[PDB]
Amino acid sequence: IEQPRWASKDSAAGAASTPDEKIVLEFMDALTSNDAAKLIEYFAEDTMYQNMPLPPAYGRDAVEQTLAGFFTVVSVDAVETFHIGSSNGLVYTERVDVLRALPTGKSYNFSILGVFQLTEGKITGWRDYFDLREFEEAVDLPLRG
Amino acid sequence: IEQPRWASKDSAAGAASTPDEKIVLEFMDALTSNDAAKLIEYFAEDTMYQNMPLPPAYGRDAVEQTLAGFFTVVSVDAVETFHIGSSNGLVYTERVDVLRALPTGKSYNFSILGVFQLTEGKITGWRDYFDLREFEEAVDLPLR
Numbered sequence: 394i395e396q397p398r399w400a401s402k403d404s405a406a407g408a409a410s411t412p413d414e415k416i417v418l419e420f421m422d423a424l425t426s427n428d429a430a431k432l433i434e435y436f437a438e439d440t441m442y443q444n445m446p447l448p449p450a451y452g453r454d455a456v457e458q459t460l461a462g463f464f465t466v467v468s469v470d471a472v473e474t475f476h477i478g479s480s481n482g483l484v485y486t487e488r489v490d491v492l493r494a495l496p497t498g499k500s501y502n503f504s505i506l507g508v509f510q511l512t513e514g515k516i517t518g519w520r521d522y523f524d525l526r527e528f529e530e531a532v533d534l535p536l537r538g
Numbered sequence: 539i540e541q542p543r544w545a546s547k548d549s550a551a552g553a554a555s556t557p558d559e560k561i562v563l564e565f566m567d568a569l570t571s572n573d574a575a576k577l578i579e580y581f582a583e584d585t586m587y588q589n590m591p592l593p594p595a596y597g598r599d600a601v602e603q604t605l606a607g608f609f610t611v612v613s614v615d616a617v618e619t620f621h622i623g624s625s626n627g628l629v630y631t632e633r634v635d636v637l638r639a640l641p642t643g644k645s646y647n648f649s650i651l652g653v654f655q656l657t658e659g660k661i662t663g664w665r666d667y668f669d670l671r672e673f674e675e676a677v678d679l680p681l682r
């Protein structure tokens with residue numbers, strides 16, 4: 394994974410400089426764990442997670458069940474964050490995630506722009522925006538949308 | 539339309555509070571014009587535009603040609619920005635675009651997070667992120 398031409402240094406991952414910005418980058422690092430039990434600790438009881446525009450998960454239980462299900466069929470091999478930034482309580486991450494389908498071994502790069510809302514240091518919202526054309530095939534589970 | 543549960547007032551459109559934020563919002567209003575000649579004026583000369591992960595357009599010529607082509611087959615009927623905000627020189631719009639295919643009259647809602655980089659008030663980068671599953675059907679152009 395190369396740095397893209399449009400990558401700007403003023404917003405690079407290495408220059409995170411709010412606590413919310415730093416917690417999110419930690420969370421990006423933990424994605425490769427493929428471990429919902431570990432990942433769920435970042436969330437508040439009042440929280441949400443959505444791969445747009447698939448049906449969102451609301452509540453920590455739903456998020457955990459959703460993440461646990463994903464890791465049954467796909468591995469997060471790599472996460473490259475190009476930009477981190479934040480504004481009006483929201484944090485933004487422009488990045489690429491590399492995903493590998495466990496049953497096939499096929500890998501997939503997904504260009505992603507994610508938004509996270511934090512309250513007292515814990516995720517109360519996480520929405521990822523990307524192309525789901527290959528996501529159906531990458532994730533051997535029905536999308537629900 | 540909409541107003542999602544996750545919509546924060548703290549980051550709403552009406553609360554845009556920098557010149558760049560003000561500009562991207564005006565650019566967002568302008569999209570419904572479907573007029574590539576009017577839109578290209580927001581763009582700097584050294585610039586790019588991409589619907590991820592389709593082949594990007596680099597330079598003002600390519601960008602205008604790309605928008606003009608899009609407006610040949612599709613209308614932008616509505617743009618609804620729920621969040622705008624900025625950080626480290628970039629602007630972010632969390633929004634919905636309604637696109638109507640001209641040959642069919644079929645309409646489409648796209649959930650979108652876009653990043654903008656402006657220079658001296660001019661667009662030097664614009665990348666929209668969203669599901670392209672219906673994009674192919676909605677836009678009667680070949681995908682590259």
Ligand SMILES: O[C@@H]1CCCC[C@H]1O
Nearest residue numbers: 424463464467469490
């Ligand atoms: O982004 C990925 C989607 C599928 C697996 C878990 C999640 O982190």
Ligand SMILES: O[C@@H]1CCCC[C@H]1O
Nearest residue numbers: 569608609612614677
């Ligand atoms: O296809 C639509 C038309 C307007 C701008 C590009 C894209 O969002």
